């Protein structure tokens, strides 16, 4: 199937999320999103752990008692932001970690 767990675009405006109080720049960045579902047969590039597999199997058997595996970011990349310091000096954070999806997987 072609509707499995995968990286798709998500452009994030810092004002929308209340972060423009401390981020001067940029206005928007490409965060990613991980979209789709984790069901058998698994999409090939989704990594999965043995727990995710077992959980997906248990969820088929008891769909009302046990959740499914979740499609989530499993590796993240940094971006750079311009924020303000104590004297109000615009300052660059070169690698602000965990901001964009590098990889998605079932977990």
């Amino acid at each position: 199937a072609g509707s499995h767990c995968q990286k798709t675009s998500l452009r994030v405006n810092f004002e929308d999320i209340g972060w423009d109080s401390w981020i001067i720049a940029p206005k928007e960045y490409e965060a990613y999103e991980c979209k789709g579902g984790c069901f058998f047969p698994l999409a090939d590039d989704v990594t999965p752990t043995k727990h995710a597999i077992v959980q997906t199997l248990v969820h088929l058997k008891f769909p009302t008692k046990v959740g499914k595996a979740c499609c989530v970011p499993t590796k993240l990349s940094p971006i750079s932001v311009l924020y303000k310091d104590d004297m109000g000096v615009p300052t660059l954070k070169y690698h602000y970690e965990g901001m964009s999806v590098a990889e998605c997987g079932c977990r």
Copy 2:
């Protein structure tokens, strides 16, 4: 709030999931499950990445276009299983990795 992302019990029977074809023992093990939700204010022991935070914020603003952060296992533990080899010899896998939840978090 007390309904946030956390480790709860999940006992898994290998027959239920079709794994008893290759696992002699045990019949059942404690896999865990990660239950609850990822919403603000975040539960304290949930780790979260900056992406999970940004995504949760974007989901509040656009709940129909963007998913929430997911409560998932973020660290896994091994267990031991007894399986069968080529001559049909019962063989012990001492650390079969990724079988039980050690930690949960929002991702």
